[PDB]
Amino acid sequence: HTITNWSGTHAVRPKRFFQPESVEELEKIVKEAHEKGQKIRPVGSGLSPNGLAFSEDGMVSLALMDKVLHVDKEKKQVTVQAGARVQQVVDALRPHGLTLQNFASISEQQIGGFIQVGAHGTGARIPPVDEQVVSMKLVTPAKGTIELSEEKDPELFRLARCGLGALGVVTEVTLQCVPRHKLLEHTFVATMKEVKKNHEKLLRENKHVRYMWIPYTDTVVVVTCNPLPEGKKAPQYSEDEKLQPLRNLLRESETSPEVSGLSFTELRDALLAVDPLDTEWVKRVNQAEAEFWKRSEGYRVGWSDEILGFDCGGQQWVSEVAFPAGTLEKPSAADLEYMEELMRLINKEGIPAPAPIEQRWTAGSSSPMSPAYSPSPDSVFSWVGIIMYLPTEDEEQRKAITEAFRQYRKLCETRLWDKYGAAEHWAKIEVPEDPEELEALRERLRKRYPGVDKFNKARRELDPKNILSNDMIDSLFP
Ligand SMILES: Cc1cc2nc3c(=O)[nH]c(=O)nc-3n(C[C@H](O)[C@H](O)[C@H](O)COP(=O)(O)OP(=O)(O)OC[C@H]3O[C@@H](n4cnc5c(N)ncnc54)[C@H](O)[C@@H]3O)c2cc1C
Ligand SMILES: O=C1O[C@H]([C@@H](O)CO)[C@@H](O)[C@@H]1O
């Protein structure tokens, strides 16, 4: 049984692979692996871009433990087995009139894997998902099955719920839901100047805001979503006219066959496949994409779970950092300054950077390991995601792009992250081979994360034989 991540950038053939159907079966596996000193890294859907959950030695999946256990109608709360995919939870909650406060760009993540990395959506007043956990059960190699909440060892709770699978196997999570509700989604394009003008008010007056930045253009795609006051309503280009700049650029007879079945994101892939690391060509692809978005202005209505998802396109390298951008009441220009510099940087160095650079916002988290950890609840973090696509399975083309991206992320590390106090998404952080880079990263982590000594303390205590951790965890936290 091989496990491969979403983008096929990491795979693992674990010597031992468990898939219990019950807590009792899980408890027994962890007791025996404790006794025998055998590795058992928790794995959810295995999607993490950086293979965080992977172990050559042993992995345990709770995929078969995926029921909604309890819905507290009054407090709008759901208790669910960790192996439930976010999508299974949404479907289950449908009849009870509830949804999650936020969704990621996909919903194939297990609830366990979702909370253990502090995954997030967008909305300057909405925390990452780890802040939405009211309680959890956790099978530990030292103390068996323990229960954590604000009431029950609140300090361990806040450490554990965003634990990177290093503190125990989550079996059960209770989540603070909200009423199931429709969103009105408004997509429109702006210039940086137009973005700057309205930004401060836009974040604060719209429930969800997302900017898709298009390198080597002055097109920013703005997507706002707000609840629809019950029974409210809402140029207009065909699909063929929207896709026309991309089809014309690919065909370069008058027409296009086979191509016409390709979606917007499949066209971008086929276009980048042509000369992925040629900047002049990527400038041409990003311009064609800007034209597509300019022809895609308008409104959509759907349940929040349908609206808050995004087509992320083909296999890819991603890097996403969270950095402080003030609070609700004291705005910071840092989120827009970061993007100015990032665009200036990409031109300065001729980076063949495709679109989009995704920019989102979350409220702060009380979880000490959250990239958006803050002591103040009304802090605001901007998250900025850079991307390079792997549009084919040409092993040589994928190697060149892997290196291209390594240097792109490396230029953001050296020039921006320290300056802006940026922390890497736990599912997207890669471990340097160069020990100078590796020490540098550990130094960066001690800077971002003050409670790192408490995380290792909690590991010694709950996982003394260290069967829950892999080379990644040990290399990041020694
Ligand atoms: C296309 C795509 C889009 C994405 N969009 C977003 C996004 O919008 N926002 C965002 O924040 N993230 C996003 N991600 C990242 C994603 O949410 C995380 O990688 C998430 O951790 C994946 O869930 P999983 O079930 O695959 O977890 P895995 O990768 O399987 O595991 C993640 C972590 O959880 C631990 N773990 C898993 N199950 C358990 C358990 N039961 N008990 C204890 N520890 C456990 C693992 O050991 C590991 O540390 C995206 C990823 C992809 C590929
Ligand atoms: O990992 C991730 O990839 C998505 C990306 O493809 C956006 O262009 C992003 O939403 C998510 O965090």
Residue numbers in the entry: 10 to 243, 248 to 265, 281 to 506
Please give the exact wording used by the authors of the publication that reports this structure:
To elucidate the structural features of GalDH and how it interacts with its substrate, we determined the crystal structures of the viridiplantae ancestor without (1.9 Å resolution) and with L-galactono-1,4-lactone (2.1 Å resolution). Soaking in a substrate-containing solution led to the bleaching of the crystals and the resulting electron density clearly indicated the presence of the bound substrate. We, therefore, conclude that the crystals accumulate the substrate-bound reduced state, outlining the structure of the Michaelis complex. Upon substrate binding, the movement of a gating loop (residues 337-344) constricts the access to the active site, creating the catalytic cavity. L-galactono-1,4-lactone adopts a pro-catalytic conformation with its C2 carbon at 3.1 Å distance from the isoalloxazine ring and C2 hydrogen predicted to point towards the flavin N5 position. The surrounding side chains establish a hydrogen bond network with the ligand hydroxyl groups. These interactions are enforced by the closure of the gating loop with two of its residues, Cys340 and Gln344, moving closer to the sugar to interact with its 1 and 5 oxygens. Arg388 and Lys456 critically position their positively charged side chains in contact with the substrate O2 atom, confirming previous hypotheses about the importance of Arg388 for enzyme activity. In particular, these residues may promote the binding of the alkoxide anion of the substrate, which in turn facilitates hydride transfer from the C2 position to the flavin N5, leading to substrate oxidation. The resulting 1,2-diketo product will then spontaneously tautomerize to the more stable enediol form of vitamin C32.
